[PDB]
Every structure is written in structure tokens, then in C-alpha cells.
Write an enzyme that holds these catalytic residues in place. Sequence first.
Site, short mmCIF file in Angstrom:
data_model
loop_
_atom_site.label_atom_id
_atom_site.label_comp_id
_atom_site.label_asym_id
_atom_site.label_seq_id
_atom_site.Cartn_x
_atom_site.Cartn_y
_atom_site.Cartn_z
N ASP A 36 10.29 -55.03 21.94
CA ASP A 36 10.73 -55.43 20.83
C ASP A 36 10.59 -54.34 19.83
O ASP A 36 9.48 -54.36 19.14
CB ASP A 36 10.52 -56.80 20.25
CG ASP A 36 11.36 -57.31 18.99
OD1 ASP A 36 12.05 -56.54 18.73
OD2 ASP A 36 10.90 -58.33 18.50
N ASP A 220 17.24 -52.06 17.39
CA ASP A 220 16.44 -53.32 17.56
C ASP A 220 16.82 -53.83 19.09
O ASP A 220 17.94 -54.43 19.19
CB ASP A 220 16.69 -54.63 16.70
CG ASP A 220 15.87 -55.63 16.62
OD1 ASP A 220 14.92 -55.51 17.65
OD2 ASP A 220 16.18 -56.72 16.16
C1 LIG Z 1 6.38 -61.59 14.71
O1 LIG Z 1 7.39 -62.50 14.46
C2 LIG Z 1 8.68 -62.35 15.20
C3 LIG Z 1 9.70 -62.97 14.82
C4 LIG Z 1 10.88 -62.60 15.40
C5 LIG Z 1 11.21 -61.62 16.62
C6 LIG Z 1 12.32 -61.61 17.32
C7 LIG Z 1 12.62 -62.29 18.43
C8 LIG Z 1 11.83 -63.59 18.54
C9 LIG Z 1 12.06 -64.42 20.04
C10 LIG Z 1 13.09 -63.99 20.81
C11 LIG Z 1 13.74 -62.88 20.55
C12 LIG Z 1 14.88 -62.37 21.31
C13 LIG Z 1 15.96 -63.43 21.95
N1 LIG Z 1 16.78 -63.22 22.60
C14 LIG Z 1 17.02 -61.79 22.98
N2 LIG Z 1 16.23 -60.97 22.64
C15 LIG Z 1 15.04 -61.17 22.00
C16 LIG Z 1 13.48 -62.07 19.32
C17 LIG Z 1 13.64 -61.85 16.34
C18 LIG Z 1 14.49 -60.66 16.15
C19 LIG Z 1 13.44 -59.44 16.94
N3 LIG Z 1 13.90 -58.25 17.19
N4 LIG Z 1 12.48 -60.19 17.72
C20 LIG Z 1 9.94 -61.11 16.79
C21 LIG Z 1 8.72 -61.37 16.20
#
Ligand SMILES: COc1ccc([C@@]2(c3cccc(-c4cncnc4)c3)CCC(N)=N2)cc1
Length: 376
Positions: A36, A220
Site C-alpha cells: 500500500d 496509491d
Molecule cells: C492505517 O489505516 C489505513 C486505512 C486505510 C487503508 C487503505 C485500505 C484499507 C483496507 C483495504 C484496502 C484495499 C481494498 N481494496 C483494494 N485495495 C486496497 C485499502 C484505504 C486506502 C489505502 N490506500 N489503503 C490503509 C491503512
Amino acid sequence: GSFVEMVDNLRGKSGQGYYVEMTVGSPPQTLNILVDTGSSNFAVGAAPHPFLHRYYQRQLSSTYRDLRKGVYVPYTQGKWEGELGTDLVSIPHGPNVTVRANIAAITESDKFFINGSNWEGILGLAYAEIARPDDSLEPFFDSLVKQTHVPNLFSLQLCGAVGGSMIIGGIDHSLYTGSLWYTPIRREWYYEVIIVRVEINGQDLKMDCKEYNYDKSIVDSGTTNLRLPKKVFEAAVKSIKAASSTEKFPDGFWLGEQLVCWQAGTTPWNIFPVISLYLMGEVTNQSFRITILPQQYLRPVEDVATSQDDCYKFAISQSSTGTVMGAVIMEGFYVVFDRARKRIGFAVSACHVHDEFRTAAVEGPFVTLDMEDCGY
Ligand SMILES: COc1ccc([C@@]2(c3cccc(-c4cncnc4)c3)CCC(N)=N2)cc1
């Protein structure tokens, strides 16, 4: 554990992100972890949940250290909560090293985990400024760089069908063709960049370039779609509807709310236009463009029930928090997160999208004399 071991170290399911195998604790507990670039925590499921195959069991790790501090993260789509600690972490098909890193043990969550996604945690690769609960919680990649001799760079080669590669510490020249074009990282929080121009089948959207980046633009890997600020989204949709007018789709399609399907193998790609995103270059009023085909922004939805046909969701959606160049934009580009030089490079990937008429591209340079600053 060099680049030549790191290739094809990612897997995924369409619309559900890309994950890498990691281990946490001692003895190692194997977990799949979503890569991520849109967040900055290493956060792993650490209690049972209907959608988790497995989870981090802190009691079974000799080397776990509790930090005696909770973390609670409500965000747009859902929420999670957990306990902070540290433990030993490695990436088996990544660099050949083990580091001690912060880990947020997720004890409760709502709409965070996804049914059948095959990942149990998130590796946030962005900077400390957006770590939760605050910027004092050192992100994983920072710990990695500090504790090893790994260069301060990583790259992502995401592929559609899914899989691909995360190469840490350097640039794998077998994973792209042609030139690498760099855009500056505007601020180190998200991977913030600047879009200077948008074309849809070569037709400029003719907006002030600040609108493209209201209120930021980010790269992202943890967002599926290309997300666009309202004004830009409405203009993009009008142009794509105009280009594709030989067929008419329900409004629900345009809203990302329903599928469009065609008989197997008959998707009419050539009625859909290409989208060009021009990114700020490394020198004043120079830019380069990355071109996005419909094979990228019409995301296939695999479903045995619908499989007489090919079905797609429109993977462009409206945003109130700025532009997000998500996974559908990254797919088929080799994307270099050159943290050392504060820049992101783009090149055509080994798994780029193309048919016999058109190909995804990275092309430059382009000049605009009549330019203001495109950032907010
Ligand atoms: C630390 O808190 C977070 C909150 C949201 C995320 C998030 C996330 C959280 C859970 C699942 C997903 C995801 C869902 N589907 C596809 N890819 C990623 C994405 C939202 C935005 C992003 N770039 N990451 C990550 C960390």
C-alpha cells in the site's frame, strides 16, 4: 535475495489489491500483506475474523514487544483498531534481511478485510507524516533503510490478468522497456505528485491545471480506481461517453455501481478512448504523459456465473479528497518510488496493456510556456 529472486513476488485478485508474502515474529509466522503506497502503517490481523485465513499470534512470538499504546483508525470505507508493538519482520522473496519494525496488531475491524482476498495485513509504504496515531510511529520502509544497507528506493510492477513484482533497493531493468520518466514527489506524506494536463483521445479537458490536483494527487497502490475530483470526473465521463456513443450504458455503469458485459471475447475496446495524464517533469514547464487504455480503466470482474460473457466495472470514480492514481493506473507501468531523490519514475512495463491498434505509453518531453503552478 537480489532482484533477479524478487521478480513475481506479488499476487492479487482483481479489485482487491496486490500482496507480498512476509513473516512476523520468532519463529516466523507467514502472512500475505497488501502493498500500500497510500498509507504508512504496518498493520496485521491479530485476532480471528470471518475473512482471515490466518492471523498474527503475538503470544507465540518470543521476540514481540508490546508498546502499551492503542491505535484507532476510522477511514472512509471502514475502520480498524489495534495495539502497537514491535517484532522481527522479513520479506522472504524480498531483500535477504530481517529487521525489527513497528506492528499494529489489529484486534477489531469493520469492512477492512475482504472476503477471499487472501491477504491478512497491510504494508503502508508512504511516509511518517500520515502514520497513525501520529508521525512518531516509524514506518516499515524507514526502519528497513535505517537497519540495513538497502538503498532508499523501491519499485512496483503491477500486472493485470493477477500478479507482479516489488523490487526493493534498486531498479530492475528487465521489468521495463524504453525510457524512465520522473515526476517530483511534491511533499513527503502520501506519494504526492502534480498532474499538469489531461487528454481524452488527444482532446485536452481545457481546465486550469489546479483542478487536476484539488486538493492533492497521489500514487496509491492501495486504491483500485483512478479517482478524480468532481469537476475533472464529470468532464472525463462526458468525453468518454462522447467517444463511445455508438453504445449506450446505464447511468449505474458510469457510477461504478453496475457491470457492463459483452459476449466472451467481443469487448469493443476501440469505441473507448485513451486517457492521457501529463505529469510534472523534473524541469520547469516540461512534462511527460502516461497513456491509459480501456483495458486498464474497464476492470474485469471474474465471476463463474457471468462467464459466458466478459464483464467489467468502470474503474474511474469521483473523489472529494483529490486525485488518486490507483492500481488500474499503475498496471502495465514500472513505477519507481525513488525516495532518495524525491521522485517517482514511470516506464512501460513488461506486462503493459495493448491490443493490435494501441499500446499503453510513457512519452515525453512536452513543453508549456503559458504555465502557472498546478498545485494547491
Ligand atoms: C492505517 O489505516 C489505513 C486505512 C486505510 C487503508 C487503505 C485500505 C484499507 C483496507 C483495504 C484496502 C484495499 C481494498 N481494496 C483494494 N485495495 C486496497 C485499502 C484505504 C486506502 C489505502 N490506500 N489503503 C490503509 C491503512
